């Protein structure tokens, strides 16, 4: 498995922007519009 490095593939887990934005809304952040 160690040398199993596919050069092309479908979208990786880290590239799920919907889960990213979800977590940012749940995390602490600067001030949002009121």
């Amino acid at each position: 498995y160690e040398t199993f490095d596919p050069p092309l593939h479908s979208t990786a887990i880290y590239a799920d922007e919907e889960e990213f934005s979800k977590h940012c809304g749940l995390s602490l952040s600067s001030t949002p519009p009121g």
């Binding site: 498995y1 199993f4 596919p6 050069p7 092309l8 593939h9 479908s10 979208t11 990786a12 887990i13 590239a15 799920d16 919907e18």
Partner: protein, 223 residues
Amino acid sequence: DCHLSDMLQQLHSVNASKPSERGLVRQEEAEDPACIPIFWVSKWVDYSDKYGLGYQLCDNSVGVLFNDSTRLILYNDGDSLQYIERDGTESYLTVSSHPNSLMKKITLLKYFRNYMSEHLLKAGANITPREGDELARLPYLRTWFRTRSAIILHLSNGSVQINFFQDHTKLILCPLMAAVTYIDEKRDFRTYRLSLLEEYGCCKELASRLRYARTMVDKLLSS
């Protein structure tokens, strides 16, 4: 292929009607959730420079179309296997009790399965397939190719799937029901009867992807 010929005729009829050039487009009237597909490709890995193309179907089964034109499918029970030879001949086995001649291909399939489970998002996880109670036979990947804009996947049951790289949109074409399922950039899944898209029209985004689909089905037929 009898199915590709049907799909081509279905797509020419809808595309010839210019569905986006209507006074009032009523795409919603074409929705028919009863045509929701049972199987679609939810993950894929293009290692064709060494081994082949691995993929996952929505039921969590996995498969590999090796560079030697054979296919190995691992059912979602994690043990049952289906081997399809170059000429289409199908045989059935298990990882537990297999022929020794398939041990390397089984090992490769496991690597594909592990890589997909560890690194890749599952497309269509929100959407629930039409259920034959798993009676529906598992399709295999007959052929595929990649273009500048998308990867095209032709399954043994006749369906054609087109995944567009830029915006993550996808078309699932089902010639048996003359239907198409569109997953938009919002990952929202909708299934339409092509005949009803012809009658009621559709938005420009889907209409253009249906023109692209026709170009791709012609390509599949020319090969």
